[PDB]
Write an enzyme that holds these catalytic residues in place. Sequence first.
Site, PDB file in Angstrom:
ATOM      1  N   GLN D  11     -82.805   5.516  44.799  1.00 37.94           N
ATOM      2  CA  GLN D  11     -83.674   6.302  46.014  1.00 37.94           C
ATOM      3  C   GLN D  11     -82.724   7.069  46.752  1.00 37.94           C
ATOM      4  O   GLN D  11     -82.537   7.390  47.882  1.00 37.94           O
ATOM      5  CB  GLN D  11     -84.470   5.098  46.719  1.00 37.94           C
ATOM      6  CG  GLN D  11     -84.941   5.438  47.598  1.00 37.94           C
ATOM      7  CD  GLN D  11     -85.373   6.192  48.907  1.00 37.94           C
ATOM      8  OE1 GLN D  11     -83.332   5.213  49.968  1.00 37.94           O
ATOM      9  NE2 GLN D  11     -85.113   6.469  50.351  1.00 37.94           N
ATOM     10  N   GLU D  62     -90.015   5.137  41.435  1.00 41.60           N
ATOM     11  CA  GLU D  62     -90.278   4.781  42.790  1.00 41.60           C
ATOM     12  C   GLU D  62     -91.049   6.389  43.057  1.00 41.60           C
ATOM     13  O   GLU D  62     -90.181   7.200  42.963  1.00 41.60           O
ATOM     14  CB  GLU D  62     -89.995   4.507  44.034  1.00 41.60           C
ATOM     15  CG  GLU D  62     -90.374   3.572  44.733  1.00 41.60           C
ATOM     16  CD  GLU D  62     -90.465   2.773  46.367  1.00 41.60           C
ATOM     17  OE1 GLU D  62     -88.951   2.886  45.916  1.00 41.60           O
ATOM     18  OE2 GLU D  62     -91.237   2.261  47.059  1.00 41.60           O
ATOM     19  N   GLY D 135     -82.209  -1.956  42.423  1.00 39.88           N
ATOM     20  CA  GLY D 135     -82.632  -1.857  41.616  1.00 39.88           C
ATOM     21  C   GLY D 135     -82.630  -0.917  40.325  1.00 39.88           C
ATOM     22  O   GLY D 135     -82.361  -0.769  39.010  1.00 39.88           O
ATOM     23  N   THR D 136     -83.082  -0.040  41.049  1.00 42.01           N
ATOM     24  CA  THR D 136     -83.497   1.119  40.100  1.00 42.01           C
ATOM     25  C   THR D 136     -81.693   2.083  39.458  1.00 42.01           C
ATOM     26  O   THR D 136     -81.605   2.205  38.976  1.00 42.01           O
ATOM     27  CB  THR D 136     -84.072   2.696  40.502  1.00 42.01           C
ATOM     28  OG1 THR D 136     -85.566   1.619  41.245  1.00 42.01           O
ATOM     29  CG2 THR D 136     -84.102   3.805  39.675  1.00 42.01           C
ATOM     30  N   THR D 170     -78.875  -4.214  53.938  1.00 41.67           N
ATOM     31  CA  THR D 170     -80.238  -3.795  53.800  1.00 41.67           C
ATOM     32  C   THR D 170     -81.236  -4.822  53.038  1.00 41.67           C
ATOM     33  O   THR D 170     -81.937  -4.300  53.014  1.00 41.67           O
ATOM     34  CB  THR D 170     -80.722  -2.236  53.544  1.00 41.67           C
ATOM     35  OG1 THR D 170     -80.299  -2.237  51.843  1.00 41.67           O
ATOM     36  CG2 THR D 170     -79.443  -1.388  54.294  1.00 41.67           C
ATOM     37  N   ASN D 219     -75.831  11.745  53.961  1.00 45.77           N
ATOM     38  CA  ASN D 219     -75.749  12.455  52.529  1.00 45.77           C
ATOM     39  C   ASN D 219     -75.441  13.580  53.242  1.00 45.77           C
ATOM     40  O   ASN D 219     -74.976  14.432  51.506  1.00 45.77           O
ATOM     41  CB  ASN D 219     -77.094  12.203  52.090  1.00 45.77           C
ATOM     42  CG  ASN D 219     -77.516  10.702  51.986  1.00 45.77           C
ATOM     43  OD1 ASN D 219     -76.710  10.362  52.038  1.00 45.77           O
ATOM     44  ND2 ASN D 219     -78.902  10.675  52.218  1.00 45.77           N
ATOM     45  N   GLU D 245     -59.322  17.475  33.848  1.00 44.25           N
ATOM     46  CA  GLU D 245     -58.171  17.779  34.677  1.00 44.25           C
ATOM     47  C   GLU D 245     -57.739  16.529  34.968  1.00 44.25           C
ATOM     48  O   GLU D 245     -56.641  15.552  35.772  1.00 44.25           O
ATOM     49  CB  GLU D 245     -58.018  18.644  35.729  1.00 44.25           C
ATOM     50  CG  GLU D 245     -57.025  20.142  34.975  1.00 44.25           C
ATOM     51  CD  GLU D 245     -55.598  20.486  34.935  1.00 44.25           C
ATOM     52  OE1 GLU D 245     -55.735  19.482  35.798  1.00 44.25           O
ATOM     53  OE2 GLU D 245     -54.974  20.934  34.373  1.00 44.25           O
TER      54      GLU D 245
END
Lengths: 48, 195, 430, 430, 19, 18, 431, 44
Positions: D11, D62, D135-136, D170, D219, D245
Site C-alpha cells: 500500500q 489488498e 505485511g505486503t 502507525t 510521496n 554506474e
Amino acid sequence: RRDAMLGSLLGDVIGGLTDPNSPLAEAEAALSHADKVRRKKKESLHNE
Amino acid sequence: EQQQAKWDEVSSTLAYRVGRAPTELAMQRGPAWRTRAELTELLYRAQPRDARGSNPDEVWTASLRDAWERILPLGSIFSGLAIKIRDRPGELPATRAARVGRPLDPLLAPLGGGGTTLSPATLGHPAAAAAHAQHVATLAANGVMLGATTNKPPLGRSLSARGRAWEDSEMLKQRVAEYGTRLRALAPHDPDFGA
Amino acid sequence: MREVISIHIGQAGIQVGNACWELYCLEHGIQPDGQMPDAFNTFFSETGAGKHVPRCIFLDLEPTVVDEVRTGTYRQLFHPEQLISGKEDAANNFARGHYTIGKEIVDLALDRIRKLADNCTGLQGFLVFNAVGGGTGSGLGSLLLERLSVDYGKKSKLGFTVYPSPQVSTAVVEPYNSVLSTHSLLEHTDVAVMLDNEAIYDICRRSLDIERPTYTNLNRLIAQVISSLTASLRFDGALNVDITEFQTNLVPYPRIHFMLSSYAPIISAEKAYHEQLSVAEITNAAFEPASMMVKCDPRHGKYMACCLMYRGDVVPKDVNASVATIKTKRTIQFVDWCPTGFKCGINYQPPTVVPGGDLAKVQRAVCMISNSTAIGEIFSRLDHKFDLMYAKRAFVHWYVGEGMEEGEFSEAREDLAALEKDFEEVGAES
Amino acid sequence: MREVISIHIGQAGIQVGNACWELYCLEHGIQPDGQMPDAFNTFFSETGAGKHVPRCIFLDLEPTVVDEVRTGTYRQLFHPEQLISGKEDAANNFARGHYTIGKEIVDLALDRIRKLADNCTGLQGFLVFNAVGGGTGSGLGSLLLERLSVDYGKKSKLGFTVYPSPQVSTAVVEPYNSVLSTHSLLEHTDVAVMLDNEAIYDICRRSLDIERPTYTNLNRLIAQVISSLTASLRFDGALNVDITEFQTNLVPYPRIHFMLSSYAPIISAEKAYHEQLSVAEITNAAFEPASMMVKCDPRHGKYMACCLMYRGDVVPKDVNASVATIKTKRTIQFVDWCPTGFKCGINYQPPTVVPGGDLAKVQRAVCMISNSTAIGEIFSRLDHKFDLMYAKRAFVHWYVGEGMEEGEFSEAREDLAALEKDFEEVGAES
Amino acid sequence: KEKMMMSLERDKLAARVDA
Amino acid sequence: KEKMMMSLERDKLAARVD
Amino acid sequence: MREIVHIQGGQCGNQIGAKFWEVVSDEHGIDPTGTYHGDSDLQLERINVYFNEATGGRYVPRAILMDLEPGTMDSVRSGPYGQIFRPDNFVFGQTGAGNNWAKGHYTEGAELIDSVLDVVRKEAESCDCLQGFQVCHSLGGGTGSGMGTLLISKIREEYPDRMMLTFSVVPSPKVSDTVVEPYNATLSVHQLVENADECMVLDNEALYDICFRTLKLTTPTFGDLNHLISAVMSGITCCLRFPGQLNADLRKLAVNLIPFPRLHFFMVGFTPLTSRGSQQYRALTVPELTQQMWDAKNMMCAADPRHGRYLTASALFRGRMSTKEVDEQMLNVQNKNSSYFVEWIPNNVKSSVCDIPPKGLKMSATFIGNSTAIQEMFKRVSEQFTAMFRRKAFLHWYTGEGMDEMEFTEAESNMNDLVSEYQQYQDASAE
Amino acid sequence: GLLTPDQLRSALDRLHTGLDAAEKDRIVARVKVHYMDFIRSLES
Ligand SMILES: Nc1nc2c(ncn2[C@@H]2O[C@H](COP(=O)(O)OP(=O)(O)OP(=O)(O)O)[C@@H](O)[C@H]2O)c(=O)[nH]1
Ligand SMILES: Nc1nc2c(ncn2[C@@H]2O[C@H](COP(=O)(O)OP(=O)(O)OP(=O)(O)O)[C@@H](O)[C@H]2O)c(=O)[nH]1
Ligand SMILES: Nc1nc2c(ncn2[C@@H]2O[C@H](COP(=O)(O)OP(=O)(O)O)[C@@H](O)[C@H]2O)c(=O)[nH]1
Ligand SMILES: [Mg+2]
Ligand SMILES: [Mg+2]
C-alpha cells in the site's frame, strides 16, 4: 571509558541523595532553617 | 636614550598630574595594541578554511594547483585590472611572521616582557585578574558594600589592571582553546621575553 | 573591491537603517523592488539577474520593528534570512540582552555575518548602528561586537551609537544599560562616533525650522552623516578618503577613540535660495557648537584630530582657504601636542535628497568627524546619574536575576571612571 | 535503449508510485489519458498510435487501494492488468505475504515481468517500492526479490523501501516485519536506499512550511528523488550516470549497500523569488543532517561513499568547487581509506514541478545519495524494538500459525546482528 | 542487545540438546 | 542480575552438550 | 508572538472583563459573532496577543471566566459581545463564597482551582511563548478575591519567568458595599505582594469622581465605571498589538516602574477624558493632554499625587505624534514641580509612542504611576481592619473554614511592611 | 466580502490549486457571491 563515566555519574547522583556533605543536603538544611524561622516568627508575632 | 629619559619624565609628570600609575597611563598602551595585533593576525592565519571563508571560487581556484593565487577582476573586460591575492593556509607570510616584544622598557617588568602568549592559562593579563578576583571574593565574603556613597568617586584603574582588557576575554580564551593545535602548528613556542 | 557590512541592532538600529537604506537606494538608483534601471558594490551585492540586495542584517529581539520592514515598502529589497528576529525583547535589560536571551540569537547572527563576508571579496570595515540606552541595542550589541573583535581581526569597526542626553531621555534605566555597555564599546569598537537625541532635535528646531518633528525626521539626516563619511568609496573624488583613514588619523591612543559628528548645510527648501552656500560659510557653520550632533561645547575642551568630508563642487583651494581661517579663530582651540589637526576629503557628488524629506538639494556639504576632549563631558553627565541611582541599588534585581552578579555593576562603573580619567589625562598640557 | 522496469509492492508503494507516475508524465509531456500532444522510452512504452503505457506493475494483496488508481485520474494510462490485486491483504504479517497468500499472486506477478522484459530491448535495472513495516511490502516483497534474483541473474536492483521511525510508526508489529524483510534485503537487493516517514514530516514542516501534511505530500517529493536519480538516462547532460554506474561507484562490499538520500532545494511556492540558489549553496544544504530522508545522524558515522546528481543549469566548474568545500568541512567526516569520495552527474534538464505541487520552480537541484556507517543507528534502534518485543514472545502466535517456523526469527536477528558487526568494523580506522 | 544475542545462542544450543 | 543467571545456564548447557 | 492570558474573577472581574473584551475586539475588528471585519491589515497583524485561531476564521479570546456563582455567568453570556467566549473556559461553582475570603480560598476554592488551572494550563501551552498573565478581580468579594488571589499564587510557581498584571479594585472608604470589605482586602494584598509582579490598582470612588467631573455625567451608570477601566487595559498592551515609533512591551514597563520588588503597586490614569458637551471646544494637542494626565482629578486611585512623591512614571502614548513633544513635556512636568518627584531616580518618567490611536480619538495616553502616595490608600484598609480585628467582630465566619487567626495577624503585618517601605523611600535622600 | 467569479478564479490561481480552466469553472460554479460560504463549501 563509558563504564567509568557510568560509575562516576551514578556515584555522584546516588551519593548526593544521602550524603550529609552533599549540596542537596546543604539546600535542605537551608530551607528547613528558613521554614522553622518563618513559623517561629509568625507564632511570636501572634503571641506579641 | 635622551628620548627615553624625556618619555620617563613626561610619564611621571602626567601620572602625578592626573592621579594614576605610570603603567596605567594611556601613553603606554603601545605594547597592548601590538600584542592584540599579533593575536588577531595569528588567529586569522590559523583559522580553519570555513572560519577563514567558505567562498566556492576562492577555495577551489586557490587550491587548483600547488600555487595559491586568485585573480580578482576589476572593471570591464576591455580595460580590466587584476588583484593577485596570494594566501597560503597554515603559514604566516614571511614579512608578517614576527612576534615582537620589548625587554628594555621597565614598565613591562611585572609582565615579564610584554609579548604574545598563545597558551590559554597565560593569555592576556592573568596575575592581575587573579588578584582582582581574590579581592572581590574577599570583599564579598566580608560583606562590605562599595557603591553606597556618592561622595567617594571610584579610583580609575584600567582594563589591563582589572584583567578585563581585550586579550583577557573568555571568548578569545575559548577560541584559542578550540584552535590551539593548529595555532601551535603555526607558532611553535611562546617565548618569555624577560631575559 | 570596496565592500562594507553594516549591522543594525535594537529598535533604534533598524529605524536608523530604514532611513539609511532609503537613501542608498536613491544614490545608486536602486528601486524598492531591488532592480537598477560598479559603484554600487560597497553597500549592495548583485544577485542573479539584475537584483541587488543590501549588505546588512537587521537583528532585534523584539519582532515589532523587524516585521514592519518585512511588511513595509522594502519587502523585496532585503533577504528574508538577513532580517533576524526573536520571540521576546530584551525589555530594557542589559543582562537579558547579554546573558539570557542574547546567547541563543547571536549564533544565528554570526552565521549570516560569515555568509555576507564570504560572498564579498574585500571587507573594508563594519558599521554598527545601535542605541546603548536600550536592552537589545546595548546588551546584544555588546555580545555581537565581542564576537567581531575575537573573530574578525584587523578589520575596523565604525560605531554609531545613539546615546542618552542629560536633558531628556525616554527610559528610566538609561544609566544602567549605557554604563554596562561602556566596556564593550571601549575595547572592541575601533572607531566610535557618538550621537545624542535632543541635540539633533535642536538641529531640526533651529536649522530646519520645524517645531514638531519625529524619529523619522531625526534619522533621515543621520543617514546624511553616514552616507557622507562612506561616500569616498562609492564615488571618485579629489581626495579618496577610505574607511581605514578614519582609524589611522582620528585616534592617538587606542582606548580614546570617541568622535563627534556634524553636518554643515541643514537648511529647508525656502531658506535655501536666500542663503549662499559658501565653502567658508559651511566650514564655519560645521565647527559651530550648535551644529554638533551631540551636546558638546568645543570651547570647553580642545580638538584632538579633525576629519572633514567635503562633497559636491568643492575645489581643493576653498577647502584650504576656509580651514586656514578656522585655525586663526581664537574660539577654536586645538590640543598642544597635535599641530597637524585636519584631515580633508573631497568628493565629487552632491548629496541626494529623498522625496518628501526636509533637507533641500544643496550643491556642497561638509560632514565633520572630530575628536575632542569635550566628549568626556558627556560621560560625566552619566557618571553622577549612575552613582545616585546605584547608591540605593534601585532597578538592580532585574539585572541580578537574569544571570548577572551584583558585582558586575562595580567594575562597569569603575570602567567608566577609567574613561573619564583618560580624557582629562590627554587634555592636560605638558 | 536505456529503460527501467519499476515494481511497486504494498500500500505504500502504490501511493508512492501514484505520485511517482504523476511526475513522470510531466517531464515527457504525457497526458493523463496517455496520448502525447525519444526520451520517453525509459519509463513509457510507445504502443501503436501515440499511446504511452508505463513499464510498471502495481501488485498488492489488498484491492482497496489498487482500485483507487483504477477509478482515479490516471485510469487510461496503465494497462488493465499490469495493476495486480488480490482477495485479502497480508495485514502486518510476513508469514501471510511470504507463505500463505503470497504464493498465489507471485506466479501471476512474475508472468507480467517476463512480458515487460520481452518488450524492453536492453533492460537496465529494477526498482522496488515497498514498506517493511507492512505485511505486503515485507512478505510479498521478499518473495518477489527471491524469485527475480533466480530468474533474472546479475541484474541491478535499487531498493527504495520505507522503514519505521524511532518515534512515529502507525502499527504495533513493524519491528517484527522489518527484521524479517532484512534477511532478503541484504542478499537479493544490490542497492537499498533508506527512506523514512517522519523524517519527511520534518522536511515538509520546516522547508515547505506545511503545518499539517499528509501522505500525499510525502510521496510527491519522494517522487522527486527517484526522478532525479533516473533523469540521466532520459535526458542529455554534461556527466551521465547509469543504474550500473551507481553500484560500482557507491557500494564497496557485497553486504554494505544501504545508503541515505537528500534532495537539497526544497522551497514552498511563496519562498521562491527571495531565495538565491547557488550550486555550492544547495550542496551545503544536501549534507545538512536535518535535510535527510531518514532519521540518521551523519556526524555519528562517517560518509563512507557518496554521490551527487545535479539537474538544470549547473556548470561542471561549480560541482568541482563545491565538492572541494565539503571534503574539507570538519563536521562532515569521511572514512580514511576513501580519498576520492564522490560521483558527480550533471543533467541539463531543470526539475519539473507538478501543477498544484508544494515545490516551487527551481533552476538547479541536488539528489545527494551517500553510503555511511551512520545507517547502523537505524538498524540499532529498530533491533532494540524487536529486542524488547521478542523477549517474552509477544505477537508470535500469528507468525507461527500460517507458515513460518520459530527458528527463522533466530536467523533474521543473527543476520541483522552480523550486519551491525560489519558496519562497525568497516568504518573503523585502519 | 547482549542479553538477546546470548538468549538466541542459548536457544540454538538447546536445539542441539534435542537431537 | 538476569543476564548473569542466563549466562551461567548457557554455559552449563554448553557443558551438557559437551 | 507575545500572548497575554486574561482571567476574570468575581462579579467585578466578569463585569469589567465583559466591558473590556468588547473594546479590544472593536479595536481589532472582531464582531460579536467572531469573524474579521477590519478595514486595515494592521489590526490583523497582531491578533494572537488576545485571541486564538479557530475553524472558519473565528477568533476565540484567551479568556477564562471563573466565579463561584452561576448568576454572573448568565449575565456575561447574555450580554453583547458575550457569545465570543469559549464555552469550555466558563468554569463556575454553585455554592458561592458569599463575600467570605476564607470560603473562596479554603473550603470551596480547592474544588474549583483544580478545574480552572487545567483550563489555564491547556491554553498556556497552546501559544508559542507567553508574555504575561492578566487578571481582573476585586478585593472585597470572596469569589474574585479569595479564589482570584489563590490562582495568582498557584500560577506563580508554575510560570515564574512570566509577568503578573493585576487590575484589581480596592474597597473604598467613602462608599462601602459589604460589611467585611477590609477582611477580604487585607488578606488579598498579602497574597498579591509576593506573587504578583505588577499590580494596577483601581477603586470605585475615584472612578465615580472621573465619571462625574471630567465626563459631566449626572447619572454615571455601573457600566460607565468599567469603560474607563476598559480603556486603560487596552492602553497598557497597546504596543504588543500594534507597531510604534518607540516600543515598550509589558516587561519593559516592569523594569522601568519597579525599583524594588515590593514597590510594584501603581496608580493609573487615562488621559483624554472630556464631556460630550465640551468635546468641540478642547484642543486635542499633546501639550493639552499632559496637563490633564498629571492632574489629581484624572487619577483612578484614592491616592493624592500632591501628598506622595512620584517614584517612577510611565506614559503610553497612542497616535501620530512628534517624538520631541512626547518627552519635552515629560521634562517640563518634572522641572516645574521637582519637589513632587523622587530625586534619587533621575528621569522618573518613561515614554512610549504607538502609531495606532484607539477608535474615536486621534490621540490618547495612559499613565502608569509608581508613587509613594499609594501607601496612603492601604492605610484606610489597615485602619478599618484593626478597628474590627481588636474586637474580633465577623471573625468566626472566617475561622470556620479551617483558617486560623494566625494568618490574619501576618497578613496585616505585611501590609504594614508595604507602607513602611514606601514611607522609607519617600523620606530617602541623596548621598 | 462579496466576490465576482473571475476574482475567485484568480484567487484560486494565486492559491495554487493546480486545477485547469474547466475544473476551476466547475469549482467556482458549485457555490456576485460571498467568500465565507465558498470557504464553507470547500471546507465541508
Ligand atoms: N536617533 C534615533 N534614536 C532612537 C530612535 N528610536 C529609538 N531611539 C533611541 O532608542 C531608545 C529606545 O530604546 P531602544 O534602545 O531602541 O530599545 P532596544 O534597542 O530595542 O532594546 P529593547 O527595547 O530592550 O529590545 C530611545 O531612548 C532613543 O534614544 C530613532 O528613531 N532615532
Ligand atoms: N511515505 C509513505 N509511507 C506510506 C504510504 N502509505 C503507507 N505508508 C507506510 O506503510 C506502512 C504500513 O504498510 P502499508 O504499505 O501501508 O500496508 P501493506 O504493506 O500494503 O500491508 P497491507 O495494507 O495489509 O496490504 C505505514 O506505517 C506507513 O508509514 C505513503 O503513501 N507514503
Ligand atoms: N468598578 C466596578 N466595580 C465593581 C463592579 N462589579 C462589582 N464591583 C465592586 O465589587 C465590590 C463587591 O464585590 P463582589 O461582586 O461581591 O465580588 P465577588 O463576591 O467575588 O463576586 C463592590 O464594592 C463593587 O463596587 C464593576 O463592574 N465595576
Ligand atoms: Mg527593543
Ligand atoms: Mg494493503
